[PDB]
Structures are given as structure tokens and as C-alpha cells.
Amino acid sequence: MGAIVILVVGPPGSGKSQLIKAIEKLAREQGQPVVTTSVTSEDEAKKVLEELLKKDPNAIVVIEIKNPRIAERVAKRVLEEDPTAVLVVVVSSPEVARELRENLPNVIVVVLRDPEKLKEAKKQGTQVLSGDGNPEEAAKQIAQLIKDQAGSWS
Ligand SMILES: [N+]
């Protein structure tokens, strides 16, 4: 099918590790292998992606990003390394999400509050899903969105 790459973007305290735990658990239940990596710089991402996303592995790769400022370059690096990867960016801030949407043609999702900033994000194509603070629902919602817009997830 191809690689599904999920960037999970947000500062410490955004729910990333719990969201990632829920995504891994649901994926195991569906018989799909998931691997995770946490990156702090664009080259770290290059290093791990150039090793891992070698031959469009049929796998889910989750990338944890604690520094939202690097998200865009890491997203671009993913596409550079594997132009045949599905890329889903789960972002904590609606403002970051809007900025990433403007700079990429990639699925960008917010589960997370300010109604005005959220509307602005959605206007640039940010997708909103229920399950902020409920990792299990969130994981379910993300998997449904990937199925409907990207493929089986198998
Ligand atoms: N919200």
C-alpha cells in the first residue's frame, strides 16, 4: 500500500505520548506494525527517515515533534525522502496547523479551542476531529480519517 507517516506535533503537555500509545495500540489490534521516533532537528529527521523510509515500507511511522517550529521542514523532509508516503500531521495549536496548511498540500488535523483561530485553521483546510483529551477516541477518529482520505491503513 505504502508508508503512512504521522507527525504528532506539540510542546510538552500536549498529550503526544498518550496519543501515540493509543495509535500504536489500535494499529496492533488491526495487525499493522507501527514504529515511533522522536526528532528535535531537521537533520535528525533526515537521518532516521533516509534509513527507515528506504523502500516505501508498508508501515506506520509515528514522528513525535516537541518543537512545533521544525514541523514544516520535517514534513518537507518526509516528502523529499518518500514522495510516495501518506503524511498526516496532528497538531496541538490551531495557529500552527494553519501555518502548516498554507505551506503544504498534506492532511493536517487538529483535535484541540479558540473558536476564531480554529475557524481560520479550517479555512486553510485544517481537519478537525473529536477526541481532544481522549486518546482512544482520537486514535479511532484519526484512523477513520486516514481510511476515508488516504487508504485502508490496512
Ligand atoms: N475545542
Numbering used by the authors: -1 to 110, 112 to 153
Give me lines lifted from the publication on this model:
Here, we attempted to design an ATPase de novo, through the exploration of an optimal backbone blueprint to incorporate a conserved phosphate binding motif, the P‐loop, into designed structures. Many naturally occurring ATPases (Saraste et al., 1990; Walker et al., 1982) possess the P‐loop motif, with a sequence pattern of GX1X2X3X4GK[T/S] (X indicates any kind of amino acid residues). The P‐loop motifs in naturally occurring proteins typically show a cradle‐like conformation to grasp the phosphate moieties of the ATP molecule. The designed protein, based on the identified blueprint, was found to be a monomer with high thermal stability and exhibited ATPase ability.
The crystal structure of one of these designs, PL2x4_2, was determined and found to be nearly identical to the design model, both in overall structure and in the P‐loop motif. As a result, the blueprint with a 14‐residue helix, a loop with the AGBB ABEGO torsion pattern, and a six‐residue β‐strand was identified as the most optimal for allowing the Lys residue to point inward to the P‐loop cradle, facilitating the interaction with the β‐phosphate moiety. The P‐loop motif binds the phosphate group of the ATP molecule, while the adenine moiety is enclosed by a loop structure leading to the last helix. In this design, PL2x4_2, the adenine ring forms a hydrophobic interaction with Pro134 and two hydrogen bonds with Arg112 and Gln116. Arg112 is further stabilized by two hydrogen bonds with Gly11 in the P‐loop motif and Asp131. The de novo designed protein with the ideal P‐loop motif demonstrated ADP binding and ATP hydrolysis abilities as expected. However, these abilities are lower than those of typical naturally occurring ATPases. The simulations suggested that the low binding and hydrolysis activities might be due to a suboptimal binding pocket for the adenine and ribose moieties of ATP, as these moieties were detached from the binding pocket during the simulations. Furthermore, we found that the loop (the C‐terminal loop connected the sixth strand) adjacent to the binding pocket exhibited unsteady dynamic motion. Consistent with the simulations, each monomer in our crystal structure revealed different loop conformations, suggesting that the loop's flexibility might indeed contribute to the suboptimal binding pocket.
